[PDB]
Amino acid sequence: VHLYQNHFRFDQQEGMFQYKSPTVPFSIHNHNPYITPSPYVPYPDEALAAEQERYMLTLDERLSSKLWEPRFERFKLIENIKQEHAEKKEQE
Amino acid sequence: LKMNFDLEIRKRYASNIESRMLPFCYEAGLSSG
């Protein structure tokens, strides 16, 4: 068993288990070596704020409700289906 | 060809009364719901 900040896993585990289980993010002016640079940057009380954010997130289906533990079930299902199909084809 | 009735029943363990109703309907056999 290995312990981390907010998750843990067994030694031979390829996933993770949460403890609750059973720069400038989202900015288009950021830079990394795989995209072009932006020309707008140099070359490479709280109740009111909460109310404004709530007003700004109106009609946003997925984010307004939230205002997250992936399990990869569809990926595993696709892997299983492909393996079964390959096994069936091997016979013929 | 068919409907995976067992994928919808499991959501019972995931307004509130509406959420709990459909798994019960599918489990009994009420395809209409």
Binding site: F10, Q12, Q13, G15, P22, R71, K76, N80 | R10, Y13
Partner: peptide, 24 residues
């Protein structure tokens, strides 16, 4: 009951439905 069902679902997801051994 609900806790047991959730734990069983989580374990089945983690183990890929018994195809994977995570305890070794």
């Amino acid at each position: 009951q609900y806790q047991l069902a959730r734990l069983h679902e989580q374990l089945q997801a983690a183990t890929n439905g018994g195809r994977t051994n995570i305890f070794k």
